Amino acid sequence: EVETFAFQAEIAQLMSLIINTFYSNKEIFLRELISNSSDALDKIRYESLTDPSKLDSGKELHINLIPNKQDRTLTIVDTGIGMTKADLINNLGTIAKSGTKAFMEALQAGADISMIGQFGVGFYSAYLVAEKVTVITKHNDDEQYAWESSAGGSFTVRTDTGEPMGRGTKVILHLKEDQTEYLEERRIKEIVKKHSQFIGYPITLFVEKE
């Protein structure tokens, strides 16, 4: 069963701005997704202080970067708190606690897209480089779910079976054809060193099997 949902109007507008604005400094998407992973890891780390059974689904707190040139995907994996089904729908489909409104106003008043993370909407910078984004997630309190969107105003949610993750979130970026530089090891290493060198969790760049 696949459920289709409309983005909240302001989120669809934000996504359209990210997709259609001429803006060359696209590499910041990775910093924003790594920052989201770090936040999710902080949350499960904190919850596990008062309740160590929260780590029964996996004690390791880390971030993996998985390029695949055959599938033309870059995957950002973390073992953070994950998202329930309700979290997916609210946090990726609506303004929720984000500064979506302030960001869209700021862009008309001198801000630029690289500041997206200051407004709590860094996730959508994925659409600087991805034609489609799939989010696989598992929270201790829910089953594993797959969220997906190629923008255009809607997203889908379905259960995800056959490859259980334990706990956390996988952001699968199906890259645009002209954005394959972000599958190159040297380029990923450069961007991680530039923007994500102070993250408090290990970031492992996987090697391609080819």
Place this chain on the structure above:
Amino acid sequence: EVETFAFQAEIAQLMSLIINTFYSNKEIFLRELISNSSDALDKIRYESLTDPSKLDSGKELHINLIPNKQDRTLTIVDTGIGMTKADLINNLGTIAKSGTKAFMEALQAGADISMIGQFGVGFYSAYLVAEKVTVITKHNDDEQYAWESSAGGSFTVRTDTGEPMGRGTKVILHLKEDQTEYLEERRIKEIVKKHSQFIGYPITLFVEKE
């Protein structure tokens, strides 16, 4: 009744670094406290979407900046979600969900104190300019409380009566004697325009009665 608590060791260490490191760019404290206020406003805004009774304690979502040259205080007031007693003790007294550890490591690897907000500990930048900080707070689910610390490894919490706020948080900075520039209207206006010009809530700078 006044309860005295020890900071978690890493928080005491962080505070000592902020107090003792030579670092002239102190003005960023205001951006960090305004950003915290904005986050707290986002939270009550979001909670009020599904439960409008959460705004029964005050519908206005705003940030006030109150300088007082006679008391040598700068107060940052917001009508955000506020903090319960437990929130005060956990969120100001311990690492909680913050990147305290990563920040202290980053400072030994090329980061500087102006990046404190990237690690979720921007509140403690108050000690760049304040000898003592008092936090008055009211959450819908608890009574009004006053947290206070002059650093030195401890903080106090007591109930706060006689001036009920309704809902939110007041950060009262008892400024160091050489930091009174931050009570000057021109200086506050300059710093707000420099670092907090894209905040999505009204920021009102109060005029002094003197």
